Amino acid sequence: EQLAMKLLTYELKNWSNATCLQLAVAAKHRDFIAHTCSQMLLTDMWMGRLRMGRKIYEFYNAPIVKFWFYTLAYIGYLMLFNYIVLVKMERWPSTQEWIVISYIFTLGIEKMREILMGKLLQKVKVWLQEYWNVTDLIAILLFSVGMILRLQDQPFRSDGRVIYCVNIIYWYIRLLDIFGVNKYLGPYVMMIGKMMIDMMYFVIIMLVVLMSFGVARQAILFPNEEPSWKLAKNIFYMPYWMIYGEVFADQIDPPCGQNETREDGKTIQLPPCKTGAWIVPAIMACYLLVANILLVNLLIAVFNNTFFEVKSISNQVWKFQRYQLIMTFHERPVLPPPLIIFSHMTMIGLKLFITDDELKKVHDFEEQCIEEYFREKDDRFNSSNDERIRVTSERVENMSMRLEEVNEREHSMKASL
Amino acid sequence: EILMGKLLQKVKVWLQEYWNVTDLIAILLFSVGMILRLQDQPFRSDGRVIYCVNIIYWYIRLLDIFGVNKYLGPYVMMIGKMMIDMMYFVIIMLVVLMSFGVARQAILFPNEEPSWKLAKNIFYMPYWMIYGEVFADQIDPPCGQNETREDGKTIQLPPCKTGAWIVPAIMACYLLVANILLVNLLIAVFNNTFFEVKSISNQVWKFQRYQLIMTFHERPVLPPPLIIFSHMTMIGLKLFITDDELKKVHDFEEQCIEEYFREKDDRFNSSNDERIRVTSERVENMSMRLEEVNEREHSMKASL
Numbered sequence A: 001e002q003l004a005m006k007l008l009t010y011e012l013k014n015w016s017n018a019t020c021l022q023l024a025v026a027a028k029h030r031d032f033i034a035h036t037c038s039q040m041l042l043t044d045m046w047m048g049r050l051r052m053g054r055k056i057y058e059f060y061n062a063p064i065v066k067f068w069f070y071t072l073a074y075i076g077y078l079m080l081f082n083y084i085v086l087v088k089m090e091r092w093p094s095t096q097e098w099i100v101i102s103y104i105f106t107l108g109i110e111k112m113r114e115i116l117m118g119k120l121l122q123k124v125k126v127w128l129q130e131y132w133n134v135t136d137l138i139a140i141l142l143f144s145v146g147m148i149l150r151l152q153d154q155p156f157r158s159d160g161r162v163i164y165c166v167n168i169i170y171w172y173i174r175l176l177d178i179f180g181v182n183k184y185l186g187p188y189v190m191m192i193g194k195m196m197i198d199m200m201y202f203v204i205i206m207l208v209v210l211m212s213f214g215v216a217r218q219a220i221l222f223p224n225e226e227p228s229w230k231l232a233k234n235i236f237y238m239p240y241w242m243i244y245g246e247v248f249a250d251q252i253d254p255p256c257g258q259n260e261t262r263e264d265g266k267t268i269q270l271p272p273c274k275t276g277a278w279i280v281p282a283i284m285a286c287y288l289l290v291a292n293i294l295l296v297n298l299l300i301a302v303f304n305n306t307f308f309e310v311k312s313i314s315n316q317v318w319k320f321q322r323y324q325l326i327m328t329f330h331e332r333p334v335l336p337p338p339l340i341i342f343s344h345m346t347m348i349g350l351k352l353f354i355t356d357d358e359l360k361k362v363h364d365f366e367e368q369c370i371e372e373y374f375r376e377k378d379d380r381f382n383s384s385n386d387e388r389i390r391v392t393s394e395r396v397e398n399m400s401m402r403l404e405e406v407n408e409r410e411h412s413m414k415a416s417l
Numbered sequence B: 001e002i003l004m005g006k007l008l009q010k011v012k013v014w015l016q017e018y019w020n021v022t023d024l025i026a027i028l029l030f031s032v033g034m035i036l037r038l039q040d041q042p043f044r045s046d047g048r049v050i051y052c053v054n055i056i057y058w059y060i061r062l063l064d065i066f067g068v069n070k071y072l073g074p075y076v077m078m079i080g081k082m083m084i085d086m087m088y089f090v091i092i093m094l095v096v097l098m099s100f101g102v103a104r105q106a107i108l109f110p111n112e113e114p115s116w117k118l119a120k121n122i123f124y125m126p127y128w129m130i131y132g133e134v135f136a137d138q139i140d141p142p143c144g145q146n147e148t149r150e151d152g153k154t155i156q157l158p159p160c161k162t163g164a165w166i167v168p169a170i171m172a173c174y175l176l177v178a179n180i181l182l183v184n185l186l187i188a189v190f191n192n193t194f195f196e197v198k199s200i201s202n203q204v205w206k207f208q209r210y211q212l213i214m215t216f217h218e219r220p221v222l223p224p225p226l227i228i229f230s231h232m233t234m235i236g237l238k239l240f241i242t243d244d245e246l247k248k249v250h251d252f253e254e255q256c257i258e259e260y261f262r263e264k265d266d267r268f269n270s271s272n273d274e275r276i277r278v279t280s281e282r283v284e285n286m287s288m289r290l291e292e293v294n295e296r297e298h299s300m301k302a303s304l
């Protein structure tokens, strides 16, 4: 095992000092990375120096501690954001909002720094591979728009506040990326992401049925109604909530034409109903029979069938992404985003080098491993039942012919004697 | 039972039983409640509330009693096992619920002092939406409009607020995720895990039967209410056998071992793989012998 670990990572002068892990990643060979040896090596790197001035340094520059510090900074920023949104804001921002804005601005600067680390188009193409980093940029742009709008006169400030309120949701949901590190959680997130296509295919049909029912209900009643714009809302509004247990029992089949004295009041004569008002309830049944009991159970069955395959694929993919996570957090500076401005002002390993004797030793070990592999492969092949049967049949055929030749020859001898 | 100088080892062994820890904790809470209940009025109701909260543990403790039944015990074990997956679901549901509640609270009530009600308001309404309550009254209130109503003078409502039409839309997406996406995933997880958990639970219960039986064999006859007399008085599994019976048992064991080895060898030698291997080897040897005779037979032709 130790020699395997050493072989997996060592500079190759012939191949541009690229270790086996880098080549496997470039080839996207998930099986190689998912192997136990590579996973153990990645875990060893994750713990950095601890693996359980110099005393401080080993703890400080380990990737795991940097990950924890970044996570804590993010959590604090999130807490401040919540406090800001809930409480009233004056004309000028408070200290908390200044801190939040500075954090966002520095994070955007750090994203630009990652972009730049004349090939810029290739760098952008590579960067687009990370889907999270696109939504992050979009959310930052929306936040900047909200900030610009919030500092104007009264008519715009509330719009800026609403922009903040809508934007907070993305940052609240971004915690899935942080959770990704956990063994159990990451695959769960991947499966959740995968199921959304089936969810959308269900949604289309549900939307069709809901539109039909809403249009029918709206048309049956309110005969003399001007177009306006409320009709489009009314179509979608009521039926959508019926999926979740609200049936509006008050206004299913109103009494309409009847005498309703009620109590503590004079008798009131209600309108004499309308033509074809008894068809709405019946329809309201069929819709509920379809949206609730038919499609949802089908979706459940689809999930059950897809679960196993999605689980396996997600596990392998997360084991593959571990390496990118580890290297990304190894490269990053120690100070969390709020204070990385100093690191950027200052701005303004994976592989271990080995001695010649060790290189020759590793080469010898590799050749020995190859020889053992081929010998074992041949031994397994020659012990297969099919090969043994084939050899037995061929040798039996040859023996039969030789036996016949001897028998015919033995016949000649009888005459000789 | 703890006492039946090794006391640390006894405690370490005792901690293995998870029920016996919660039992002690509940007893301590009950003692605290009893002490509080006998003071003046301001504390007596707090003691009563302590009793009311404590009763739940004793009501749920009946699962241990049910454990003896063949069917029930495995069910309890499976229920206990599924809670990890339940927790993993709960974390994500909590994240989504917090996001929705904070958004709803922030969109409305712009001029609101911090106080402490906000933390409640965030969690309160969204949690119940999972179970069929949508608060139809206060989804999209009419706000800015004329509402004469009846048996009353005309009342002019506030002119709504900016961005109040975004809350309903959000309220849809949340419901589309919490209710139809995560729950069905949890159902699928349960379906996949059921078989393995069932088998493991059956085996584990069959293992725990012995501990149950011995524990209740050792205990005194009188139930706990009257065990004080037994303790004041305080203040089998194996049968002994004769020598001849011991020798007989040893002979039977040796015979069983001999039969086991003989049957194992008989099964091994009748395998198809071994027969094919022997056939091939003997055929090869026969072929060589046939060739040797044939070459030798050629010599004889010259001899004749």
Ligand SMILES: CC(C)CCC[C@@H](C)[C@H]1CC[C@H]2[C@@H]3CC=C4C[C@@H](OC(=O)CCC(=O)O)CC[C@]4(C)[C@H]3CC[C@]12C
Binding pocket: A078, A079, A082, A083, B114, B115, B116, B118, B119, B122
């Ligand atoms: C996972 C993260 C997002 C934590 C949850 C976010 C918010 C729900 C929490 C985080 C810190 C909390 C605050 C901590 C301190 C205070 C001040 C405190 O108000 C008072 O001091 C006045 C007391 C009174 O008059 O009653 C209570 C509310 C508030 C804003 C709390 C309300 C809810 C906050 C913003």
Ligand SMILES: CC(C)CCC[C@@H](C)[C@H]1CC[C@H]2[C@@H]3CC=C4C[C@@H](OC(=O)CCC(=O)O)CC[C@]4(C)[C@H]3CC[C@]12C
Binding pocket: A253, A278, A279, A281, A282, A285, A286, A289
């Ligand atoms: C899919 C299956 C299982 C449905 C089971 C229940 C339905 C058959 C019930 C539920 C609600 C009922 C409706 C509730 C109210 C009315 C108004 C009622 O109108 C009248 O009879 C008076 C006017 C007239 O037609 O003369 C006609 C039946 C209808 C549609 C009822 C017919 C049967 C419905 C659709």
Ligand SMILES: CC(C)CCC[C@@H](C)[C@H]1CC[C@H]2[C@@H]3CC=C4C[C@@H](OC(=O)CCC(=O)O)CC[C@]4(C)[C@H]3CC[C@]12C
Binding pocket: A203, A207, A233, A236, A237, A240, B140, B165, B166, B168, B169, B172, B173, B176
């Ligand atoms: C996930 C899919 C299947 C959702 C299906 C139904 C939704 C599209 C419906 C349900 C409730 C509807 C909302 C109910 C009320 C309103 C207020 C309405 O506000 C206005 O148009 C007046 C002010 C203005 O914007 O000019 C805008 C649409 C909205 C969010 C409706 C738009 C469509 C919604 C989200």
Ligand SMILES: CCC1(c2ccccc2)C(=O)NCNC1=O
Binding pocket: A067, A070, A071, A074, A107, A177, A178, A337
């Ligand atoms: C850009 C990624 C991240 C991050 C991601 C996972 C864990 C910790 C931090 C962030 O999104 N916000 C704070 N700084 C960061 O680099």
